[PDB]
Design a protein around this ligand. Structure first.
Ligand code: CLA
Ligand code: CLA
Ligand code: CLA
Ligand code: CLA
Ligand code: CLA
Ligand code: CLA
Ligand code: CLA
Ligand code: CLA
Ligand SMILES: CCCCCCCCCCCCCCCCCC(=O)OC[C@H](CO[C@@H]1O[C@H](CO)[C@H](O)[C@H](O)[C@H]1O)OC(=O)CCCCCCCCCCCCCCCCC
Ligand SMILES: CC1=C(/C=C/C(C)=C/C=C/C(C)=C/C=C/C=C(C)/C=C/C=C(C)/C=C/C2=C(C)CCCC2(C)C)C(C)(C)CCC1
Ligand code: SF4
Lengths: 183, 65, 42, 94, 217, 733
């Protein structure tokens, strides 16, 4: 298999039976057979949430929303945040309690009661690799979003256009310095 | 009299039920003591100092607040 | 709860919890731990 | 003062003495394996957290893997930032 | 059978033999079986009185009558003390016969009608419906008193207030907002802690170290 | 029949007497003496217990924060922190009279309250807190942290998370992580907090969670860092005109190297605190990349130990076999931990008073006294436990054949020399210190104060003058203006250090005389004698000539009978026991010396100490008798004041101490026969023989009543001195 390092043999606990196996476990956390079963679903869930997260950020800024994505919590909606938090907790607790009970049995993902969800016929191991890989991409890209706007900085696509305006003057080396000019 | 006092103790003639009555009545008595009873007894801790207190006399040398 | 930082205890909280912790919870605890220590293994 | 020049010189010098000078000594000292053998003989997941689950294999003809470069470059960056700090206050004591 | 949270495993004493058994006893108050019988009768009695009380507060606040937390201070045909006296005097015999009917049958009864069933509609389905509506009515009465304590309005004026602005007139925008918000959050995340307890100890029931529980067994 | 309470011991659960209850209360945490305990189960139960201790600690801090935020005056104290008293919590005592409510209404409160002496006000004000809301939030956060640790303790007891034994015995990665992350990254985050929050809050600028991503710690953010121009971070320090908490003479620097004290708080600067924790972070992170882990580089500690055998075997086999000795012994690691922790707690005490870190400290005198006495007594107890667990190691965990010829066996081979030389040092120091004190006493008695043996501590004075105290005129290193050590650091810490050490109004290197000489030698006496008792118990833990099979009896056994002349208090447990007395005396001397030196400094009367501390009637009269005047008049037949609680506590400790004398002098056998008589009396008394015991009344055992007398003694000692300290310092100031 193509590994994360050239010439590197993949470890013994990472056989190429799972989805996104590139032999990347330099720490050795996937050496328990049950903790790896949890970490797989944790990867998929963090990645799905980060997928819809970067989708939501890029879609919020592609459309004409008022604030930035980081300023979106401090905003006046129809329902106050002190009232939105518990409703969110009730709904998402329903969804995630039903999701766990459904990972206990049948050991795979799902929405509420259909495990797996898959209304359409698009389940394939190739599609599993797609999901996990675009999800890892989404997680790292969301962390990039967060730290790319770590102060009152540019929004993602705005920062993309700013990097494309001057590649050798608008980069990590410019914004790690000149930080007063940003704030 | 024996019938009266055998019937008056029927609901508590067990260990757990008498402990339940004790817990209920005592929690209630002490809670209502804190709420109204210590005030009805006019305890000084309920009335407050009714003065300035020992505020400005922090020490004989340095009269702190 | 209270204005400002919420989760400020009431004015009557000491008057309740000091008697509780001091008369009630020690009663429950000493009773439970008495029935435990005098309990016989079957 | 050109911090890039100082830090690059420091890192390259330390990597050069780590690859060409202090590699054979580090390979001799890092391998005790006489009485100090394995840490662990167990099979539980907590026993595998001490095993070399991943052996970082390099194509360097001397065995300068990612950990050797990481450590020697960490020492290099450290001494380079030290040189930059000592010069940042434009003076030295003795 | 359904449970109090989805996928819940019931305690070893709540094995579904009784009605309304959603496996809810996180404090294990029903480990003793006679205690559980007494608690079932108490559940149904608190619930009967709260059903009557909820419908009574509704009928009172529906028309121009004094508010239910101030209705006691009105002037009536009898003095307060003789009212309480006759109340205690008649409830002596009423609750005595009810306690005797519990000791004899295990269920409620009026005075001598062990099963107060003029119209013989008693069933397990009707028992479950009584229990469910009684739990619902206990919650409803608690809510009446609670959102009459935060506001100075009874059930339906507060309901109309919530209907006026659902997002801004709710419990999380009142004085008890923050504590109910955090309480709801903890109650939503609690069942997963409980499910971890069930998962990492597969099949093994745990004793929560409570005085009523006799946890040394 | 057989009982149920000692689930961990079936021998106790079959005891028909009251000894079962006590010994089950006192064997609960000796997990290795449990029934059915394995080594892995031991380590796992200890892991969970450490989680529980963490949860308890964090709940304790949350409660302090909560009560200061709720019943305290922190928002009021930050306005005028030299004249407003710190409130610990409020008092709801239904036993109070009206005068007591009128009297404990202090610090600007609406009711009875307790004046905090714990210094949490100064600490929280220094680190950036100005609001009651900040402390409320911190309490919530630390309670959540305690919940997390409690859940983790339950979690790592579960089958699929129960760690293996080798994971506990893995020392290289635990050390690497606890050195880098737990020590250096924690210092890095504390430097981040200082720089982002504490310094700007000291500069008047409020920096909270809501704006710390929107404001900068420095006018040139991170450009100086990534370009190596690190001196730009020491650009504009806080001036000597600076007032804490506002922006008058503020400054812009965040990492300075000023040294000394802030002139308005008489405390350390937050900027060199930040630089401190930054340097500490870097050093601890570089130190944490030392030992071998799963990545092929590092050290194996067994190799370092086994390679450290000197030629000539002047140490025997060197440290060969010590890795398995420390790794496989929890009492050895516990003793090393307690040694280090007690020593650094002594460091905390000795440094927090001279180099006071927290603002408006050094001006809250009672806070300083409580903190010092506190951490010193904590250190003494911890250091006694260190040797106690070293003894328990020698008994329960020591293998003489696996330590064949190493340093640890070389200790036991020449134990008589160690014990006899420690005895000689203790004996000489006691003879001579008591002799000089009694001599000066007699000279004061005979009206001739000029004949005292007043020996000038010129060694410590020479050290102080080497630090730059020009009071003595050695002109040696830092007091020598024409030296190298002076000329090199002059652009650095020195100006502030010399301005702070030549000032005689702070506790930084107080001037010392012959009273300091005599009491430092008393301190040496106490240390050497305490460690004599402890070392003797540890080394003779395994055997003596009176009892060479002592290891076969355990750590804490009563005696070996009246035979062979008498074997009372022969265990190592009893050696620790007898050393706790000498420890309490040592720390009492230490804290007496501290408290009197500082009571005379704060009152401007250092001459009283320089004159009276050279003889022991000075210590009795002018310290114990003089400063008790307001304490014991806390309540009189005319009325009471706020010091009445400390008077009552004073007498309380005097009662408890003396009650321990009852368990310490009278021994079991008078009391067992007394209880036999009382058993007869209960069995033969009508209307009362109806009531019968389930546990047979027996007297407290020998070891048990030793512990009980020591506990009554220590509690009374501690409470008496705490009351005296807080009352004699709060009464004046
Ligand atoms: C929460 C997110 C998350 C989780 C649970 C996992 C979990 C997993 N990954 Mg994935 N992965 C992630 C994010 C995540 N990954 C991201 C963002 C990337 C892109 C860099 C990858 C790239 C990646 C590759 C290329 C491979 C894996 C593999 C694995 C599996 C074995 C490694 C392991 O034990 O990880 C356990 C991880 C955790 C328990 C959480 C780690 C997070 C730590 C605490 C902080 C890290 C901070 C910093 C950003 C680094 C395991 C199922 C391997 C696999 O599937 O083999 C079957 C594999 O080949 N992952
Ligand atoms: C994942 C994710 C999350 C957590 C959010 C969260 C949010 N979005 Mg974003 N969004 C996402 C994905 C996500 N979005 C995607 C994939 C798209 C496309 C958008 C497009 C979008 C727009 C165009 C806007 C938001 C807005 C909002 C905010 C209010 C949403 C609301 O009124 O309730 C949603 C209520 C529902 C009933 C929907 C449930 C289905 C909130 C911060 C609004 C805002 O003010 O943000 C600045 C806004 O104007 N979002
Ligand atoms: C779990 C996903 C998530 C994430 C990553 C964030 C992230 C953030 N939130 Mg949002 N928030 C969330 C869920 C989330 N929130 C939910 C579920 C609610 C309740 C509906 C809110 C309600 C909320 C409010 C009311 C505010 C934030 C704010 C913030 C910011 C904190 C300030 C900071 O450090 O920057 C940050 C961007 C603050 C903000 O906008 O900063 C300017 C703010 O005022 N959040
Ligand atoms: C563990 C550390 C700790 C300590 C030693 C104390 C000590 C005290 N608390 Mg505090 N308390 C703490 C943590 C702590 N508290 C925490 C974490 C909370 C938040 C739940 C509280 C909330 C609290 C309230 C609301 C009250 C006290 C009160 C008291 C006093 C009487 C004891 C009592 O009734 O307990 C009560 C204990 C709890 C309510 C919860 C403990 C968990 C005493 C000074 C009372 C007081 O101030 O009287 C003067 C009082 O009314 N405590
Ligand atoms: C019988 C159940 C019941 C119902 C239908 C309602 C309904 C309502 N309550 Mg009441 N309430 C209840 C129980 C109930 N509550 C209880 C038990 C309490 C004590 C904690 C309260 C305390 C309370 C306060 C203090 C306030 C309300 C408010 C409200 C309104 C807005 C919802 C809200 O913010 O509160 C959410 C309510 C809770 C978190 C309490 C728990 C409710 C449980 C989970 C039952 C939920 C409904 C149930 C699933 C189905 C109902 C049956 C049927 C009618 C459909 C709404 C009219 C607010 C209002 O009207 O202000 C204008 C308000 O300020 N309620
Ligand atoms: C682990 C500790 C820690 C953490 C989490 C942070 C986190 C942060 N710092 Mg701080 N900082 C720290 C330690 C830390 N710092 C230390 C030790 C120093 C001294 C060298 C600084 C000096 C510093 C400066 C001078 C600046 C930051 C900035 C920042 C931000 C990063 C912007 C990219 C972020 C809020 C920058 C920022 O924008 O702050 C909001 C900024 O200007 N920090
Ligand atoms: C990190 C610290 C640490 C740890 C983990 C341990 C752990 C242990 N120690 Mg070590 N020890 C320590 C510190 C520590 N100790 C210190 C600091 C000292 C010196 C004081 C000692 C001295 C010591 C001895 C001498 C012995 C142990 C023993 C033990 C073991 C069992 C303890 C026991 O019997 O529990 C139960 C303990 C108790 C119930 C304690 C009795 C009650 C104490 C004295 C408090 C009384 C205060 C009172 C309530 C205050 C009231 C105030 C009120 C009036 C106002 C266990 C391995 C024993 C052992 O291993 O046996 C071989 C043993 O013999 N330890
Ligand atoms: C005031 C009380 C007091 C005093 C003076 C001592 C004195 C001593 N203890 Mg301590 N001890 C005490 C209380 C005291 N103890 C208590 C309460 C306990 C708890 C049980 C212990 C537990 C304890 C242990 C466990 C150990 C000691 C040890 C010692 C000796 C330490 C060496 C030393 O300083 O020599 C100096 C000696 C003195 C200052 C006392 C002699 C006084 C003068 C100088 C003698 C001559 C006076 C005069 C000329 C003679 C008149 C007699 C006659 C003609 C009328 C020393 C004899 C250690 C020891 O024996 O090691 C050597 C040791 O191991 N003691
Ligand atoms: C198993 C079933 C058991 C059922 C037992 C019977 C319950 C009977 C409840 C009381 C019903 C009386 C109502 C009579 C018609 C009134 C119509 C009307 O206009 O009302 C009008 C009245 C108000 O009218 C007011 O009357 C007052 C009387 O002094 C004043 O004079 C006021 O001026 C006047 O306005 O409304 C009511 O009183 C309804 C209250 C009903 C509930 C009262 C409390 C009872 C709660 C406990 C019940 C205990 C049950 C056991 C005891 C009985 C055992 C046999
Ligand atoms: C019994 C025992 C035990 C215990 C023991 C102990 C407890 C001990 C202790 C000990 C201790 C407690 C010690 C201490 C030490 C100290 C030291 C060693 C110090 C040092 C110092 C120094 C070295 C200094 C230096 C300097 C100076 C002088 C100043 C300035 C700076 C400098 C740095 C220069 C155990 C368990 C192990 C086991 C075995 C046996
Ligand atoms: S402890 Fe008591 S019984 Fe034992 S030898 Fe000493 S005096 Fe005798």
């Amino acid at each position: 298999r193509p590994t994360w390092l050239p010439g590197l043999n993949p470890p013994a606990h990472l056989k190429g039976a799972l989805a996104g196996d590139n032999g990347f476990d330099p720490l050795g956390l996937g050496q328990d057979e049950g903790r790896l079963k949890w970490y797989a679903e944790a990867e998929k869930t963090n990645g799905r949430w980060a997928m819809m997260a970067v989708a939501g950020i890029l879609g919020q800024e592609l459309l004409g929303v008022t604030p930035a994505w980081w300023e979106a919590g401090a905003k006046e909606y129809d329902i106050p945040a002190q009232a939105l938090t518990p409703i969110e907790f009730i709904v998402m607790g329903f969804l995630e309690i039903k999701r766990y009970q459904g990972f206990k049995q049948t050991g795979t993902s799902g929405f509420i009661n259909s495990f797996p969800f898959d209304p359409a016929g698009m389940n394939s191991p190739s599609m599993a690799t797609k999901e996990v890989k675009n999800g890892r991409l989404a997680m790292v890209a969301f962390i990039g979003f967060c730290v790319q706007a770590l102060a009152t900085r540019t929004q993602p696509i705005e920062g993309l256009t700013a990097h494309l305006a001057d590649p050798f003057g608008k980069n990590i080396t410019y914004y790690l310095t000149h930080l007063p000019e940003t704030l | 009299q024996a019938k009266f006092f055998t019937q008056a103790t029927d609901i508590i003639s067990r260990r757990e039920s008498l402990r339940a009555l004790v817990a209920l009545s005592g929690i209630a008595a002490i809670v209502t003591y804190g709420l109204k009873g210590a005030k009805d007894a006019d305890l000084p801790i309920t009335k407050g100092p009714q003065t300035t207190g020992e505020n400005g006399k922090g020490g004989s040398v340095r009269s702190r607040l | 709860a209270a204005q400002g930082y919420p989760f400020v205890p009431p004015s009557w909280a000491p008057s309740v919890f000091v008697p509780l912790t001091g008369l009630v919870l020690p009663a429950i605890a000493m009773a439970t731990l008495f029935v435990y220590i005098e309990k016989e293994a079957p | 003062l050109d911090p890039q020049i100082v830090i690059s010189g420091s890192t390259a010098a330390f990597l050069a003495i780590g690859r060409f000078v202090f590699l054979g000594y580090q390979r001799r000292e890092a391998n005790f394996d006489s009485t100090v053998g394995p840490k662990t003989t167990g099979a539980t997941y907590f026993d595998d957290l001490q095993k070399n689950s991943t052996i970082f294999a390099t194509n360097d003809p001397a065995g300068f893997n990612i950990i050797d470069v990481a450590g020697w470059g960490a020492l290099g960056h450290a001494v380079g930032f030290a040189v930059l700090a000592i010069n940042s206050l434009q003076g030295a004591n003795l | 059978r359904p449970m109090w949270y989805p996928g819940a495993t019931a305690p070893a004493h709540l094995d579904g033999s009784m009605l309304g058994d959603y496996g809810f006893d996180p404090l294990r108050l029903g480990v003793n079986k006679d205690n559980l019988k007494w608690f079932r009768e108490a559940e149904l009695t608190n619930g009967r009185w709260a059903m009557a009380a909820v419908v009574g507060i509704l009928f009172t606040d529906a028309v121009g009558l004094p508010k239910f937390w101030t209705a006691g201070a009105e002037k009536y045909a009898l003095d307060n003390q003789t009212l309480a006296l006759i109340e205690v005097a008649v409830f002596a015999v009423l609750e005595g016969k009810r306690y005797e009917i519990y000791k004899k049958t295990g269920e409620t009864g009026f005075l001598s009608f062990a099963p107060f069933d003029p119209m013989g509609m008693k069933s397990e389905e009707m028992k479950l419906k009584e229990l469910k509506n009684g739990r619902l009515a206990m919650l409803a009465f608690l809510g009446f008193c609670s959102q009459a304590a935060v506001y100075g309005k009874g059930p339906i004026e507060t309901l109309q207030l919530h209907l006026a602005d659902p997002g801004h007139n709710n419990i999380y925008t009142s004085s008890v907002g923050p504590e109910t918000a955090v309480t709801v959050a903890v109650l939503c995340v609690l069942p997963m802690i409980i499910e971890a307890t069930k998962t990492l100890n597969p099949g093994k029931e745990s004793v929560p170290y409570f005085p009523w529980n006799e946890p040394w067994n | 029949a057989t009982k149920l309470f000692p689930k961990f011991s079936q021998g106790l659960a079959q005891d028909p007497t009251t000894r079962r209850i006590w010994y089950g209360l006192a064997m609960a945490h000796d997990f290795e003496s449990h029934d059915g305990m394995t080594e892995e189960n031991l380590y796992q139960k200890i892991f969970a217990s450490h989680f529980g201790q963490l949860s308890i600690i964090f709940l304790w801090t949350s409660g302090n924060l909560f009560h200061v935020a709720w019943q305290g005056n922190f928002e009021q104290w930050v306005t005028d922190p030299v004249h407003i008293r710190p409130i610990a919590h409020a008092i709801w005592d239904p036993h109070f009279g009206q005068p007591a409510v009128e009297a404990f209404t202090r610090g600007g409160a609406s009711g009875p309250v307790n004046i905090s002496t714990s210094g949490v006000y100064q600490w929280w004000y220094t680190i950036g807190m100005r609001t009651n809301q900040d402390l409320y939030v911190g309490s919530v956060f630390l309670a959540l942290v305690s919940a997390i640790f409690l859940f983790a303790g339950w979690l790592h007891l579960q089958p699929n998370f129960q760690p293996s034994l080798s994971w506990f015995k893995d020392a290289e990665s635990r050390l690497n992580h606890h050195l880098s992350g737990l020590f250096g990254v924690s210092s890095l985050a504390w430097t981040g907090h200082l720089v982002h929050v504490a310094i700007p809050e000291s500069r008047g600028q409020h920096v909270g969670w809501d704006n710390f991503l929107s404001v900068l710690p420095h006018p040139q953010g991170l450009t100086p860092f990534f370009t190596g121009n690190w001196a730009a971070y020491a650009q504009s320090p806080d001036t000597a005109s600076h007032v804490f908490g506002t922006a008058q003479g503020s400054g812009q620097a965040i990492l300075t190297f000023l040294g000394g004290f802030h002139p308005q708080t008489q405390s350390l600067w937050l900027t060199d605190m930040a630089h401190h924790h930054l340097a500490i972070a870097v050093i601890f992170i570089v130190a944490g990349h030392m030992y071998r882990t799963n990545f092929g580089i590092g050290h194996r500690m067994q190799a370092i130990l086994e390679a450290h055998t000197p030629p000539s075997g002047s140490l025997g086999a060197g440290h060969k076999g010590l890795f398995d000795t420390v790794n496989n012994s929890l009492h050895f690691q516990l003793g090393l931990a307690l040694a280090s922790v007690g020593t650094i707690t002594s460091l905390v005490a000795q440094h927090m008073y001279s180099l006071p870190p927290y603002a408006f400290q050094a001006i809250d005198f009672t806070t300083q006294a409580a903190l010092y006495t506190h951490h010193q007594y904590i250190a003494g107890f911890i250091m006694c436990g260190a040797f106690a667990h070293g003894a328990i190691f020698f008994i329960r965990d020591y293998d003489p054949e696996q330590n064949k010829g190493n340093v640890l066996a070389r200790m036991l081979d020449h134990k008589e020399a160690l014990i006899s030389h420690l005895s000689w040092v203790s004996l000489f120091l006691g003879f001579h210190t008591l002799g000089l004190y009694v001599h000066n006493d007699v000279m004061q008695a005979f009206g001739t104060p000029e004949k005292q043996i007043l020996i000038e501590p010129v060694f410590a004075q020479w050290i102080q003058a080497a630090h730059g105290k020009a009071l003595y005129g050695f002109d040696f290193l830092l007091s020598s203006k024409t030296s190298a050590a002076f000329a090199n650091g002059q652009s650095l810490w020195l100006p502030g250090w010399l301005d702070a050490i030549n000032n005689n109004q702070n506790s930084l290197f107080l001037t010392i005389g012959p009273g300091d000489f005599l009491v430092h030698h008393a301190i040496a006496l106490g240390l050497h004698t305490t460690t004599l008792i402890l070392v003797k118990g540890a080394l003779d833990a395994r055997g003596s000539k009176l009892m060479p099979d002592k290891k076969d009896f355990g750590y804490s056994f009563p005696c070996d009978g009246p035979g062979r002349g008498g074997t009372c208090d022969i265990s190592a447990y009893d050696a620790f026991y007898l050393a706790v007395f000498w420890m309490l005396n040592t720390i009492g001397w230490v804290t007496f010396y501290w408290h009197w030196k500082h009571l005379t400094l704060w009152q401007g009367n250092v001459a009283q100490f320089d004159e009276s501390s050279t003889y022991l009637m000075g210590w009795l009269r002018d310290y114990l008798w003089l400063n008790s005047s307001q304490l014991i008049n806390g309540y009189n037949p005319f009325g009471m004041n706020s010091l009445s609680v400390w008077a009552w506590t004073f007498l309380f400790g005097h009662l408890i101490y003396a009650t321990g004398f009852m368990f310490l002098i009278s021994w079991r056998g008078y009391w067992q026969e007394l209880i036999e008589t009382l058993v007869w009396a209960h069995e033969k008394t009508p209307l009362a023989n109806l009531v019968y015991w389930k546990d047979k009344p027996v007297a407290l055992s020998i070891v048990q009543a030793r512990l009980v007398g020591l506990a009554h003694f220590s509690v009374g000692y501690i409470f008496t001195y705490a009351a005296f300290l807080i009352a004699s310092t709060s009464g004046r100031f």
